[PDB]
């Protein structure tokens, strides 16, 4: 359908398949192919648990993947269980993978900042740090060697500082693996998205099953404040029919138009008001022929 | 008569069919392919038949 | 988009298609499940 609908669910898919687990990518295709799923749906198609997706579906609901609607339907056998239907809320997604891996990297240059200090020193009997600012009043005397003021312990230095280069390495790592982002956000920022919800994901849905008990058709509730075409065809002999019908209808409008007899006509003249052919041509067809011989479950209902 | 096994009569052999036909990876993704819905293929049936699957 | 969509025939799920281009056009309702496949001719439609 919608080359745009494709490339979200193509976004969606890579940040499941790069940033999560494998039964994560099994929920979330389920519910980019079906457009809208309940639990038991999820339950019939995967064969999931209800304990195994709870960690799965508390997980895509903290990072804003899933949307759970809440709302519960009135089937025939009255059993009204509060079933939650998952869908997809395409800008909101968006959105949040955009925030994720924009604070995901600048997380990354944050800790990048944070390694381009020098080493410090580090007491390891203590196990407390001292940065370079603070190590510059416990030196003794002797002018030899940093020690603390609670161990009296020759501090170490740090490993940190020196892995300024593989922090590096890692933002080199993660910025060309999460390059396909950032083209299809280029396309994405790029176009229109609109602002689906669980009525907009209801017109594209794909059936899980032949028997679901949840039912996807929407139930409003009072006191919520959350063209024919028709064608003529005369074999041009009728045109003097419709004439006949158009002087007919002429010769109506102009009686029923008319001046009445008593106007156009004085009536104090009357008394007071009170209470064969075939045969011929036949023979000349045949004549002809000689010559050319010698030559050569209901509801109400409209009808729409 | 049976489904279950497939007679051929150019050659007058008895082969064992299985209800998920599947000899090789490509007739997997074949049968994959085919699926209109998102249900999982199950391994039980799957080794029905077709002597091994796991590998 | 329009001819094709999800529906409920006979309490039996399925999707709605419109075989157009064979003459005369058809209205296809396929099972889900691959159950039932069921085709209507639209030649004889009255209302
Ligand atoms: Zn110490």
Same mark, same amino acid.
Not at chain 1, 27 to 32: G, H, K, R, S
């Given at each position: 359908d919608r080359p745009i609908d494709d490339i979200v669910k193509n976004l969606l898919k890579f940040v499941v398949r790069g940033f999560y687990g494998g039964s994560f990518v099994l929920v979330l295709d389920a519910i980019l192919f079906?457009?809208?799923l309940a639990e038991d749906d999820l339950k019939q198609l995967l064969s999931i648990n209800k304990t195994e997706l709870g960690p799965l579906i508390a997980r895509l609901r903290s990072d804003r993947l899933i949307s759970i609607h809440k709302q519960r339907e009135y089937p025939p056998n009255s059993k009204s269980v509060e079933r939650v239907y998952y869908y997809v809320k395409y800008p909101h997604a968006i959105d949040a993978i955009k925030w994720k891996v924009h604070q995901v990297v600048?997380?990354?240059?944050d800790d990048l900042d944070k390694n381009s200090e020098p080493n410090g020193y580090m007491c390891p009997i203590c196990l407390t740090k001292y940065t370079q600012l603070e190590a510059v009043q416990l030196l003794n005397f002797d002018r030899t060697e940093f020690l603390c003021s609670l161990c009296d312990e020759p501090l170490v230095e740090d490993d940190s500082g020196k892995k300024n280069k593989e922090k590096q390495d890692k933002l080199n790592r993660l910025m060309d693996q999460i390059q396909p982002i950032i083209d299809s956000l280029k396309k994405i920022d790029d176009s229109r998205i609109e602002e689906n919800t669980f009525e907009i994901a209801l017109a594209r849905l794909i059936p899980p099953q032949n028997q679901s008990?949840?039912?996807?058709?929407?139930?409003?509730?009072?006191?919520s404040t959350m063209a024919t075409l028709h064608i003529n065809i005369t074999?041009?002999?009728?045109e003097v029919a419709q004439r006949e019908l158009q002087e007919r209808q002429a010769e109506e409008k102009r009686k029923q138009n008319a001046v009445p007899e008593w106007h156009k006509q004085s009536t104090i003249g009357k008394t007071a008001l009170g209470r064969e052919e075939r045969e011929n041509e036949k023979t000349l067809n045949?004549?002809?022929?000689?010559?050319?011989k010698k030559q050569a479950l209901e509801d109400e209902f409209e009808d729409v | 008569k049976l489904?279950?096994?497939?007679?051929?009569?150019?050659?007058?052999?008895?082969?064992?069919?299985?209800?998920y036909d599947v000899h090789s990876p490509s007739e997997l993704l074949k049968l994959?392919?085919?699926?209109?819905?998102?249900?999982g293929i199950s391994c039980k049936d799957l080794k029905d038949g077709w002597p091994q699957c796991d590998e | 988009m329009s001819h094709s969509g999800a529906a409920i025939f006979e309490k039996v799920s399925g999707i709605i298609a419109i075989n157009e281009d !064979?003459?005369?056009?058809? &209205?296809?309702?396929?099972?889900?499940?691959?159950?039932? !496949?069921?085709?209507?001719? &639209?030649?004889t439609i009255d209302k």
């Amino acid at each position: 359908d919608r080359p745009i609908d494709d490339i979200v669910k193509n976004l969606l898919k890579f940040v499941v398949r790069g940033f999560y687990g494998g039964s994560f990518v099994l929920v979330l295709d389920a519910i980019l192919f079906h457009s809208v799923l309940a639990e038991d749906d999820l339950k019939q198609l995967l064969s999931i648990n209800k304990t195994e997706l709870g960690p799965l579906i508390a997980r895509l609901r903290s990072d804003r993947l899933i949307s759970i609607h809440k709302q519960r339907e009135y089937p025939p056998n009255s059993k009204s269980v509060e079933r939650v239907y998952y869908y997809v809320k395409y800008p909101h997604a968006i959105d949040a993978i955009k925030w994720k891996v924009h604070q995901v990297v600048q997380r990354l240059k944050d800790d990048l900042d944070k390694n381009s200090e020098p080493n410090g020193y580090m007491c390891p009997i203590c196990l407390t740090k001292y940065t370079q600012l603070e190590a510059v009043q416990l030196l003794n005397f002797d002018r030899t060697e940093f020690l603390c003021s609670l161990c009296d312990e020759p501090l170490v230095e740090d490993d940190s500082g020196k892995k300024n280069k593989e922090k590096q390495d890692k933002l080199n790592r993660l910025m060309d693996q999460i390059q396909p982002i950032i083209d299809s956000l280029k396309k994405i920022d790029d176009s229109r998205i609109e602002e689906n919800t669980f009525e907009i994901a209801l017109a594209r849905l794909i059936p899980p099953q032949n028997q679901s008990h949840a039912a996807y058709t929407y139930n409003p509730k009072k006191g919520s404040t959350m063209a024919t075409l028709h064608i003529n065809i005369t074999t041009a002999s009728d045109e003097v029919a419709q004439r006949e019908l158009q002087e007919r209808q002429a010769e109506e409008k102009r009686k029923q138009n008319a001046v009445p007899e008593w106007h156009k006509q004085s009536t104090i003249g009357k008394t007071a008001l009170g209470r064969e052919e075939r045969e011929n041509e036949k023979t000349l067809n045949d004549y002809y022929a000689a010559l050319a011989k010698k030559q050569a479950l209901e509801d109400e209902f409209e009808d729409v | 008569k049976l489904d279950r096994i497939e007679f051929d009569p150019k050659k007058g052999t008895f082969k064992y069919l299985s209800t998920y036909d599947v000899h090789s990876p490509s007739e997997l993704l074949k049968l994959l392919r085919s699926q209109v819905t998102f249900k999982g293929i199950s391994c039980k049936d799957l080794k029905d038949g077709w002597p091994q699957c796991d590998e | 988009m329009s001819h094709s969509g999800a529906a409920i025939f006979e309490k039996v799920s399925g999707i709605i298609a419109i075989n157009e281009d !064979v003459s005369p056009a058809e &209205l296809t309702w396929r099972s889900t499940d691959g159950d039932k !496949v069921h085709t209507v001719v &639209l030649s004889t439609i009255d209302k």
